[PDB]
Amino acid sequence: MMAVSELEVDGVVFPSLARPPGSAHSHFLAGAGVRGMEIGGNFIKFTAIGVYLQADAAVSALAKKWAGKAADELASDAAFFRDVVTGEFEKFTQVTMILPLTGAQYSEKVTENCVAYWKAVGAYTDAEAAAVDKFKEAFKTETFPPGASILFTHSPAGVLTVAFSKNSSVPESGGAAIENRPLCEAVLEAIIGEHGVSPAAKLSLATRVAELLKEAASVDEPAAAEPVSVSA
Ligand SMILES: O=C(/C=C/c1ccc(O)cc1)c1ccc(O)cc1O
Questions:
Q1: What's the rounded Cα separation, in Å, for the pair 141 and 226?
Q2: CA distance 51 to 91
Q3: Where is the Chalcone isomerase domain (predicted)?
Q4: Residue of 35, 93, 96, 101 to test ligand 1 pocket, by largest number of atoms within 8 Å of CB
Q5: Antiparallel, parallel or unpaired: β 143-144 and 149-154
Q6: Ligand 1 near 46 CB (within 6 A)
Q7: Which of 51, 104, 165, 172 has the smallest count of CB within 10 Å of its CB?
């Protein structure tokens, strides 16, 4: 069993462990990073994003394809981020405001992008339109001042739990629960996927996952300088 370190991103502290809203599973901080936009050739910071994974399950699920790889190989491999997104384990995303945003701004930006992509790939069903209504519904009249958070729990059955906090505190319970795999994945893939808005969170995630898998490989590994066995 292992631990990871805490991360601080432009003043936002993401603890090494958390429990997502609506879940009993402990999660570890897999990666965190700034989300910004280049306007001018100035990098303007909008949010700090922490990506947490199910402590029980994620390493074991990822090791099979990713053990052996250096951080810079995971960081440049679209299939690694896609395995994180689509993994058979729970994920938890925490988006914490650096600049203020409103509920309508955030939800409009994400759902319009989702919808555009789904139409482009020919996979836009009534189920997705109804999931987008439900998502927009949860966000209308929320507003997010600096330090407030948006909280997403991503289930492996493809249920997205949305919740909000006024600060970095993560609440016990969930808010809306949207049973739609495409939107549940899209929300996280919008962050760490090929088109991901946080290259920083991606590089962090690659680096720390690579480290975790390497320490794990070396635990149960026979060395002559440590011969003192505990089996018969
Ligand atoms: O809505 C946002 C920004 C709008 C904006 C408005 C005026 C500007 O000058 C620049 C950006 C926004 C920013 C980051 C994000 O992750 C999700 C979002 O929805």
A1: 61
A2: 7
A3: 9-212
A4: 101
A5: unpaired
A6: yes
A7: 172
Q: Are 101 and 125 in contact (CB under 8 A)?
A: no
Experimentally determined by: X-ray
Which one of 12, 37, 39, 46 would you pick to mutate in the ligand 1 pocket, going by the greatest count of ligand atoms within 8 A of its CB? 46
d(CA 196, CA 194): 5
Q: Is 96 in the pocket of ligand 1 (CB under 6 A)?
A: no
Element (H, E) at 153: strand 149-154
Whether residue 164 has its Cβ less than 6 Å from ligand 1: no
Residue entry with tokens 């897999």: 30
Closest atom of ligand 1 to CA, residue 110 = 19
- At 196, list the tokens: 């991901």
CB atoms under 10 Å from CB of 198, counted, come to: 25
Resolution in angstroms comes to 2.1
* Dihedral angle over CA of 146, 147, 150, 151, nearest 10: 180
The domain spans of the chain are 1-232
> Are the C-beta atoms of residues 198 and 34 closer than 8 Å to each other?
yes
